Write a protein that binds this ligand. Structure first.
Ligand SMILES: c1ccc2c(-c3cnc4cnc(-c5cn[nH]c5)cn34)c[nH]c2c1
Length: 252
């Protein structure tokens, strides 16, 4: 209830804010129904690996979202093109990515748009999941509801979403996570989209892993990926299973 400076715009606009009395820094979203849902979902969320939502003020027609500030920037910038990043660094971001994702699912919320751009790093380099503008509720009162709407980024998106009227929410999220894993370890994205028309996707389906980006990826990491980027969302590895994966538990 005290003045905030509005020092700079981080990323509708997002501008970093610092308190005059305390000097605490906050990320404030400036928005000039989707907004209402975003706030509604944020109220729900409390986790170390999910961005913290402080509050909202309705001013004029402008909506204010008070969110945790990540000095780290986005994970997107920690990947060198065509190289990615050290395997130890990737595993840790992935462990954190899984933690944030697991929490949302128990909570019954799916992000629906997981990408490096949406994964933020704090001062300690800890991963945070950012932006619930596309997020939705997939479990209420212990009953699941199938999703039929299409949203996300095409490279990150699951194959089922493209070819099916209705799909499970959780499996779509795991696929996006796997793709993020691929980028961290390869520095490049496998296909423009997960389609038979796309040549790169077909090769992966054919198992031609002697080609980029698979060639860059180590065999242990790759084995996990084979399990994650499985076209049948029903046969796709689950998060509990990811934890049991050998690479996932490999000391690096
Ligand atoms: C450098 C440093 C911080 C950020 C951010 C940033 C830092 N903290 C937040 C919090 N929320 C957002 C955000 C929320 N919705 N859309 C973006 C972006 N942040 C985005 N891009 C950056 C580049």
């Amino acid at each position: 209830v005290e003045d905030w400076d509005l020092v700079q715009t981080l990323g509708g606009e997002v501008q970093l804010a610092v308190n005059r009395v305390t000097e605490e820094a906050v990320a404030v979203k400036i928005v000039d129904e989707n907004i209402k849902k975003e706030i509604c979902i944020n109220k729900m969320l409390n986790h170390e690996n999910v961005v913290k939502f402080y509050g909202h003020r309705r001013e004029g027609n402008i909506q204010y979202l008070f969110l945790e500030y990540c000095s780290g920037g986005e994970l997107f910038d920690r990947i060198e093109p065509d190289i990615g990043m050290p395997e130890p660094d990737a595993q840790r971001f992935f462990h954190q990515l899984m933690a944030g994702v697991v929490y949302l699912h128990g909570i019954g919320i799916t992000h629906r748009d997981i990408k490096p751009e949406n994964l933020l790093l704090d001062e300690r380099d800890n991963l945070k999941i950012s932006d619930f503008g596309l997020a939705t509720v997939f479990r209420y009162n212990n009953r699941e509801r199938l999703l039929n709407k299409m949203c996300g980024t095409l490279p990150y998106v699951a194959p089922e979403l493209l070819k099916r009227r209705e799909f499970h929410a959780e499996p779509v999220d795991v696929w996006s996570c796997g793709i993020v894993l691929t980028a961290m370890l390869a520095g490049e994205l496998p296909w423009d989209q997960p389609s038979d028309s796309c040549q790169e996707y077909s090769d992966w389906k054919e198992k031609k892993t002697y080609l980029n980006p698979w060639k860059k990826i180590d065999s242990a990491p790759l084995a996990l990926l084979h399990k994650i980027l499985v076209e049948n969302p029903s046969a796709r590895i689950t998060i509990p299973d990811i934890k049991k994966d050998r690479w996932y538990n490999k000391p690096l």
